[PDB]
Amino acid sequence: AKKFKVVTTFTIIQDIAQNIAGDVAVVESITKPGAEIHDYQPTPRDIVKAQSADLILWNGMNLERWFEKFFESIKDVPSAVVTAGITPLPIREGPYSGIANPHAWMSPSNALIYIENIRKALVEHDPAHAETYNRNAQAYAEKIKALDAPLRERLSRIPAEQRWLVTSEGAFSYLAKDYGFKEVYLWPINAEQQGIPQQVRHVIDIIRENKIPVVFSESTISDKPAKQVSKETGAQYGGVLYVDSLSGEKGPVPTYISLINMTVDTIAKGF
Numbered sequence: 001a002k003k004f005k006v007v008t009t010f011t012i013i014q015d016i017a018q019n020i021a022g023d024v025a026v027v028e029s030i031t032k033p034g035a036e037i038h039d040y041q042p043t044p045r046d047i048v049k050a051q052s053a054d055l056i057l058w059n060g061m062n063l064e065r066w067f068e069k070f071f072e073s074i075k076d077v078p079s080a081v082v083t084a085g086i087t088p089l090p091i092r093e094g095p096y097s098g099i100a101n102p103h104a105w106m107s108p109s110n111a112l113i114y115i116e117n118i119r120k121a122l123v124e125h126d127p128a129h130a131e132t133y134n135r136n137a138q139a140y141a142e143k144i145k146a147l148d149a150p151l152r153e154r155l156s157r158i159p160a161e162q163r164w165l166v167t168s169e170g171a172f173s174y175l176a177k178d179y180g181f182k183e184v185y186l187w188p189i190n191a192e193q194q195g196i197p198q199q200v201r202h203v204i205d206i207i208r209e210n211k212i213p214v215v216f217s218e219s220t221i222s223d224k225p226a227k228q229v230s231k232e233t234g235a236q237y238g239g240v241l242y243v244d245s246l247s248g249e250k251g252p253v254p255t256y257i258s259l260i261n262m263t264v265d266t267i268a269k270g271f
């Protein structure tokens with residue numbers, strides 16, 4: 001009858017978890033493709049959705065500023081933080097300085113740890129399907145491991161000194177560390193905040209000093225500040241990167257694997 005039901009806070013976890021669950025459990029996301037996840041405002045239908053689940057997955061590292069208050073309205077549903085065991089990179093400036101940068105999934109090696117935490121959660125709370133979860137997790141982990149070589153090859157045309165990654169949110173720190181990029185951003189983490197117009201001038205100084213050819217925005221936030229930066233520098237606007245959300249199932253970024261590939265592909269294109 002009713003399959004084991006998993007509810008996640010946002011879409012990236014949904015797709016990783018669904019790959020481990022296979023045909024044996026149904027995984028749904030509270031947030032919709034394209035929606036901003038950091039300061040999402042849960043509605044009454046989200047409570048019913050989360051309350052209907054057998055297990056709730058969230059990122060932690062205070063990604064979902066809304067989750068803990070929301071979860072107080074949910075009774076008798078176990079939850080698991082899928083970043084357990086990941087060493088955080090701290091936010092480097094702004095009013096959230098020193099807090100964990102929550103975007104750990106942009107490192108494919110960190111995704112192996114996401115996968116293991118989700119597998120553990122599913123095996124524990126749905127032990128009747130532990131064998132399917134264990135098989136699916138190991139197969140999906142191998143798919144993630146197979147990304148490292150093509151990803152580095154795709155970025156290999158860009159010499160080390162020119163590997164500057166200029167984005168809107170500083171959401172790519174884990175990806176940048178993995179593939180040897182230095183990061184510049186217009187704001188360190190999505191939030192309601194001051195300091196963005198002045199950071200735009202500092203970034204402009206950095207674009208000129210280092211001859212950076214391309215700046216990017218992201219799929220859940222406005223492209224306007226990055227487009228402005230491109231106008232008042234030489235650098236071209238390299239388009240939209242994906243980090244905080246997948247696209248819809250027929251859009252360009254329907255899976256976690258496609259999010260990593262398309263973000264790296266768009267970066268490489270921009271150079």
Ligand SMILES: [Mn+2]
Nearest residue numbers: 169171190244
């Ligand atoms: Mn973000």
